[PDB]
């Protein structure tokens, strides 16, 4: 019994393409009525899962859901057990809330022996990626046990400021992504870099302008920054934290390779059937999904995937299915999880729209097509960020996905988590 990661020989999942909806999503985020509504708003979700223990984080805003204020940030971990009718869910076992809510930004979780490290960024100038021209660079680690004890005071919660940073040539590092992986006694966190634009070494001749007649050569170089005349260009990567020493807080930034170099976006690195898989959101001209399995971690080189059917929507400047360099910084985070390696099958919640951010639809794509899909809400329900993680329930693969949707009787976009069972039959 229990819940384990993707290891061993699971049950055979369907492989062919069919239209019969064999997917049965089940909501596991039953919230009480909000009678007496107000201008509430929940954003910046977080969901990590590993070896049967999950985490969660959210920022509750009062007012406009983008330019609002902060009231509370619930960051807590818990176990993953069966509700009883052979349906997995996320049971909470510990909850932590910081005192000042307008300090924590861009958290990142990871699993360890009997803890759950949550690496967040501390800033006193607002959101970092919007005001990075004055950020200090301090990073705070939060440890939350997955099984608290009576009167520990040092086992259920422990924080410490990260002092030493091994930044190679950048200026500031920051955790950027939902979750990471473990390698026995080493922790890895997804992150982004901040390099000076003037100190960037990138020849303006490797831009893929094969068939992009209506474009410009320097679009690749201009797209690496949040703005055309920006002062810092982003760079995805990983943060290494070797906790096997504990002599001094170490921060080792592992930059990504130059293959398909895009702007910095929330990245996710997870384990699947022994080999770690990597994901990177598309907040640049390259609107297609950026999947890939990692073969080398210390020097980060990921074998990308040439998927030409799954992408994310955006604005008019850089809409979906765009494969040409254009100066733009927009998109939505929609990841997936590798459920099989022999056939290289993935599964994730992606949006189905050209220039809007509605209609969240669960979909399973092998490499260049969609096998079976299933919608979660109506064709008009809005959605911004989706986080997908898969696990096992004693004989078979299950996937719990956090999909922010617009509830009818709530009038607020609350992060609701579903539960989809991958079937063992086609049609």
């Amino acid at each position, epitope marked *: 019994e229990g819940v384990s990661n993707l290891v061993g020989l699971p049950n055979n999942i369907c492989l062919q393409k069919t239209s019969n909806q064999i997917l049965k999503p089940k909501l596991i985020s039953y919230t009480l009525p909000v009678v007496g509504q107000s201008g509430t708003c929940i954003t910046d979700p977080l969901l990590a899962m590993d070896e049967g223990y999950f985490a969660y984080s959210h920022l509750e805003k009062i007012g406009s859901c983008s330019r609002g204020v902060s009231k509370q940030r619930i960051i*807590g971990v818990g176990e993953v057990l069966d509700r009883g009718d052979e349906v997995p869910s996320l*049971f909470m076992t*510990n909850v932590w809330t910081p005192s000042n809510p307008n300090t924590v930004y861009h958290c990142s979780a990871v699993y360890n022996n009997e803890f759950y490290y949550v690496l967040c960024a501390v800033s006193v100038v607002g959101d970092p990626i919007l005001n990075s021209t004055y950020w200090s660079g301090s990073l705070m680690m939060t440890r939350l046990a997955v099984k608290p004890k009576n009167n520990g005071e040092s086992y259920n919660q422990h924080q410490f400021a990260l002092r030493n940073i091994e930044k190679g040539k950048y200026d500031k590092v920051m955790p950027y992504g939902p979750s990471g992986i473990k390698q026995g006694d080493t922790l890895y966190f997804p992150a982004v870099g901040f390099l000076v634009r003037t100190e960037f070494t990138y020849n303006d001749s490797n831009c893929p302008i094969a068939e992009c007649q209506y474009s410009k050569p320097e679009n690749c170089r201009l797209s690496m920054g949040i703005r055309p005349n920006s002062h810092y260009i982003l760079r995805s990567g990983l943060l290494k934290y070797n906790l096997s020493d504990e002599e001094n807080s170490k921060i080792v930034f592992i930059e990504i390779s130059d293959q398909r170099l895009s702007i910095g976006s929330p990245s996710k690195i997870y384990d699947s059937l022994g080999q770690p898989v990597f994901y990177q959101a598309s907040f640049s001209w390259d609107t297609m999904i950026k999947f890939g399995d990692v073969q080398t971690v210390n020097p980060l080189v990921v074998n990308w995937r040439d998927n030409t059917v799954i992408s994310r929507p955006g604005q008019s400047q850089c809409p979906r299915f765009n494969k040409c360099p254009e100066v733009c910084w927009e998109g939505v985070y929609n990841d997936a999880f590798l459920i099989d390696r022999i056939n290289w099958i993935s599964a994730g919640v992606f949006l189905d729209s050209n220039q809007t951010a509605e209609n969240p639809v669960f979909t399973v794509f092998k490499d260049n097509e969609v096998l079976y899909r299933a919608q979660l809400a109506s064709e008009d329900t809005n959605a911004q960020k989706t986080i997908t993680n898969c696990f096992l329930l004693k004989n078979k693969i299950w996937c719990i996905s956090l999909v922010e949707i617009y509830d009818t009787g709530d009038n607020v976009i609350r992060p609701k988590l579903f539960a989809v069972k991958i079937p063992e039959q086609c049609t």
Partner: nanobody
Amino acid sequence: EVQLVESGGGLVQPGGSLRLSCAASGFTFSSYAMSWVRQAPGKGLEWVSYISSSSSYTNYADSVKGRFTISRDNSKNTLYLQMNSLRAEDTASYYCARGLAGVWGIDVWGQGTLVTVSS
């Protein structure tokens, strides 16, 4: 289907002592976790207590750290709460669930129970 049956009333003098019970049926109560949650009109969720499976770990909130203590009666499925020395800031509807605070819940909130502390 999981059925949650709340109990306990309200309209008590300030500083009194009430006992809020909540029984359940369906899932095996012997090995799970229970937590009281409350919400006043105008605010959201806030955990009130927490308890483990074998009545080993017990957690509370900073506002009610020393007010009451949760219990467990695994023999006869129940969930008591011996509230003591309540204040006016405790007038809210209490509920029972299977998660500490979260935004979670693996069953529709059945009826709830209101507790009024005033005059």
